[PDB]
Design a protein around this ligand. Structure first.
Ligand code: MG
Ligand code: MG
Ligand code: MG
Ligand code: MG
Ligand code: MG
Ligand code: MG
Ligand code: MG
Ligand code: MG
Ligand code: MG
Ligand code: MG
Ligand code: MG
Ligand code: MG
Ligand code: MG
Ligand code: MG
Ligand code: MG
Ligand code: MG
Ligand code: MG
Ligand code: MG
Ligand code: MG
Ligand code: MG
Ligand code: MG
Ligand code: MG
Ligand code: MG
Ligand code: MG
Ligand code: MG
Ligand code: MG
Ligand code: MG
Ligand code: MG
Ligand code: MG
Ligand code: MG
Ligand code: MG
Ligand code: MG
Ligand code: MG
Ligand code: MG
Ligand code: MG
Ligand code: MG
Ligand code: MG
Ligand code: MG
Ligand code: MG
Ligand code: MG
Ligand code: MG
Ligand code: MG
Ligand code: MG
Ligand code: MG
Ligand code: MG
Ligand code: MG
Lengths: 205, 138, 174
RNA sequence: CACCUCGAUGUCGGCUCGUCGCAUCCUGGGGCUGAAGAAGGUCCCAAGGGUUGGGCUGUUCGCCCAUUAAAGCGGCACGCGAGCUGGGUUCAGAACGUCGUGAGACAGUUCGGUCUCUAUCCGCCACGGGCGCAGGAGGCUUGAGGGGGGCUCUUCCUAGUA
RNA sequence: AUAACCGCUGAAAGCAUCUAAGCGGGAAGCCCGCCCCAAGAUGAGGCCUCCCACGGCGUCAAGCCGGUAAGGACCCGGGAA
């Protein structure tokens, strides 16, 4: 179930076949597998990956030259591709061909403490007529004596954003092995420069 | 003359087959052992019990239509968070857990009842961890 | 009266092996295992096999007929048990054969393709008549059933898949 | 009926926010038809999701316009005023009809009429601190168990075939 | 895996019967599948890699004190947090 780490670079549009095709280019660099998981030692199947080669040594003492391909140990190792057992070490963007569909996990921009209405797209209060300081407010939260309490899922304002988000079935528009680029259309989560992991789709697999 | 009370005792183990044993009828005794109401020094506030190991628990058998008709329910916290799970489904997904459940409900409630339940170790199919003595009981 | 749970069976190509819950038939055309009640003895005698019930309550009586007939079928089974005919009626409707599989056109926008299950064999002597060959009776009758359920007989016309025999019908209609 | 509440359990409607029931409005699956087809009728299964925008009236409801797959019915203190409104009702002003000699009065009408910054506990949304997880650490991850989600229409080909 | 339903095989009841023993189909529903949280799952899981088994009193059931080790903190420059 092929997968590879990357960073959101930025967006643009591509003009394919006289159509616009807005695209989000994510760079998925070479990915030096530093561990494998086995139903023997582990009980499931995956690859550790590792990405962004930097630090000279901030790596300190716990480390792997155990798989030793961690030579130039990487900043972010973010790991499981789950059931993926690749060809040799070092998965590349060669992994994906254009027209392939893919799911993309990433970290949604943090909005911090966000009202109901933007958290939950609540309606809010009227801006006039009676009004009185409830324009941006949630309304009733419950009934009366029964149940005499508030349901355990109840949509309210709190930290919103800065969370795991996986937008699915994205089309691979292009892949540029040269610079390790990759082009998908649209939705992919989070800030430019943030980490994204990129997997084959679950429409079929 | 005060009534005798145990000093710290030796935690005897015990092994049980469960294959073909009924359920609640197997449960009854597993409870009694767990409490140690078979020991003549029995003390309510302490729990000098037996540790119980039960095997072949996928193999408990039960009467009537219970395999289909009997339901376990789980309320989460949430609207419509009551889950309804048939016996067949349980056994097929987590075998045992049905014996663990039947026994738990039969142990008392409170700090100590919850401790005794730790002393009942249930496994599916044959074998188990071989550490202690575990005299086979029938 | 004179209820059919205790006549006698038949010999001559075939063996009967009574196990505790099951009996193994094993005759010229194949072998069938008949699950039977654990209770209720079945006794094999000369050139015949009987079945006897423990009690006279309707619980054993009902099991009694069933059990005799269940075994008997397996004996009829392992010597010529197939039958199950099925003629196809109406215009565009024809049946063809593909390898072991059966393909029929009943008037959908596709052909419908039915592979035979284990121990079942298809025959098409004319495109408009079919035959389902088998050792196992219940499995023949099912497979036959399944075929007929694609396009069952219309109420308003003769079009469909008909068990041979199985008379025809007129509402009439408009 | 008069049982808790008159040393106070704020009352219609709206709005916001829902959650549940199923006697199901729609969608899915069915039987019967006085079911040719299409389209209905009736009854069974089914609560997953859905269930429009306006005119009029304080209205609920209803009627109507234009649509729709449909424009479901109930419960939750006729859900929800320490969430909002305040049109209605329901103080004090004023008028009409009417009743009363009168003062006044009317589930009759009319116009007007103070809706209280600070959340202790439970509950709910978020977020940390502590300790535990019997050697301590830096990574990585299994998923028991939860939650989210769950709608539907038109057209075209099949085929102007059956 | 099931609902209503449609069937097979099939007695009790020589016939018949989807049902009493069985089996097969069969729903936007159920259980999985998807996405998210998730080991306070005190039933506290697992894998990789590190540091190491000092010195004294407690001559002992746990410890204790001082530096330590791997590692952390603190302080600082910042951040689509
Ligand atoms: Mg922010
Ligand atoms: Mg939002
Ligand atoms: Mg507004
Ligand atoms: Mg204002
Ligand atoms: Mg209130
Ligand atoms: Mg309550
Ligand atoms: Mg009273
Ligand atoms: Mg009285
Ligand atoms: Mg009162
Ligand atoms: Mg009071
Ligand atoms: Mg009060
Ligand atoms: Mg119903
Ligand atoms: Mg229908
Ligand atoms: Mg019709
Ligand atoms: Mg109908
Ligand atoms: Mg529903
Ligand atoms: Mg106007
Ligand atoms: Mg108006
Ligand atoms: Mg009205
Ligand atoms: Mg309307
Ligand atoms: Mg409601
Ligand atoms: Mg009322
Ligand atoms: Mg109310
Ligand atoms: Mg108010
Ligand atoms: Mg209140
Ligand atoms: Mg007013
Ligand atoms: Mg007054
Ligand atoms: Mg007068
Ligand atoms: Mg008045
Ligand atoms: Mg009045
Ligand atoms: Mg004024
Ligand atoms: Mg006013
Ligand atoms: Mg309280
Ligand atoms: Mg904490
Ligand atoms: Mg789970
Ligand atoms: Mg779930
Ligand atoms: Mg046409
Ligand atoms: Mg069935
Ligand atoms: Mg029959
Ligand atoms: Mg018969
Ligand atoms: Mg049955
Ligand atoms: Mg099935
Ligand atoms: Mg759907
Ligand atoms: Mg996770
Ligand atoms: Mg832990
Ligand atoms: Mg752990």
């Amino acid at each position: 179930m092929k997968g590879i780490l990357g960073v959101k670079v930025g967006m643009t549009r591509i003009f394919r076949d006289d159509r616009a095709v807005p695209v989000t280019v994510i760079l998925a660099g070479p990915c030096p597998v530093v561990q494998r998981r086995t139903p023997e030692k582990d009980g499931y199947t995956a690859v550790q990956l590792g990405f962004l080669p930097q630090n000279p040594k901030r790596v300190n003492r716990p480390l792997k030259g155990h798989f030793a391909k961690a030579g130039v140990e990487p900043v972010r190792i973010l790991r499981e591709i789950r059931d993926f057992n690749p060809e040799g070490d070092t998965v590349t963007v060669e992994i994906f061909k254009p027209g392939e569909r893919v799911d993309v996990t990433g970290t949604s921009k943090g909005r911090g403490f966000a009202g109901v209405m933007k958290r939950w797209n609540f309606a809010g209060g009227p801006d006039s007529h009676g009004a009185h300081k409830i324009h941006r407010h949630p309304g009733s939260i419950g009934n009366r004596k029964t149940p005499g309490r508030v349901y355990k899922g109840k949509k309210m304002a709190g930290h919103y954003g800065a969370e795991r988000v996986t937008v699915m079935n994205l089309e691979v528009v292009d892949v540029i092995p040269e610079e390790n680029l990759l082009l998908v259309k649209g939705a992919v989560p989070g800030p430019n420069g943030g980490l994204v992991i990129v997997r084959e789709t679950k429409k079929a697999a | 003359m005060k009534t005798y009370v145990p000093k710290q005792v030796e935690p005897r183990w015990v092994l049980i087959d469960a294959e073909g044993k009924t359920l609640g009828r197997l449960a009854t005794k597993i409870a009694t052992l767990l409490r140690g109401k078979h020991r003549p020094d029995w003390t309510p506030n302490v729990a000098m019990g037996d540790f119980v190991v039960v095997v072949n628990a996928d193999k408990i058998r039960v009467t009537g239509k219970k395999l289909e008709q009997k339901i376990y329910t789980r309320y989460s916290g949430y609207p419509g968070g009551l889950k309804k799970i048939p016996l067949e489904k349980m056994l097929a997904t987590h075998p045992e857990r049905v014996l663990e459940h039947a026994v738990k409900g039969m142990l008392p409630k409170g700090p100590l009842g919850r401790r005794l339940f730790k002393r009942l170790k249930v496994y599916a199919g044959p074998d188990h961890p071989h550490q202690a003595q575990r005299p086979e009981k029938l | 009266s004179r209820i059919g749970r205790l006549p006698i069976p038949v010999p001559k190509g075939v063996s009967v092996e009574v196990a505790p819950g099951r009996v193994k038939v094993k005759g010229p055309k194949g072998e069938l295992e008949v699950p039977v009640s654990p209770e209720m003895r079945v006794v094999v005698e000369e050139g015949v096999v009987r079945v006897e019930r423990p009690s006279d309550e309707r619980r054993h009586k009902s099991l009694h007929g069933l059990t005799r007939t269940l075994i008997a079928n397996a004996v009829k089974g392992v010597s010529e048990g197939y039958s199950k005919e099925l003629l196809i009626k109406g215009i565009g409707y024809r049946a063809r054969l593909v390898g072991r599989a059966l393909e029929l056109t009943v008037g959908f926008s596709h052909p419908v393709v039915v592979e035979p299950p284990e121990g079942i064999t298809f025959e098409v002597p004319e495109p408009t008549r079919v035959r389902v060959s088998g050792i196992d009776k219940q499995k023949v009758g099912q497979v036959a059933a399944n075929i007929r359920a694609i396009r069952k007989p219309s109420a308003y016309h003769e079009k469909g898949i008909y068990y041979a025999g199985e008379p025809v019908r007129l509402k009439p209609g408009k």
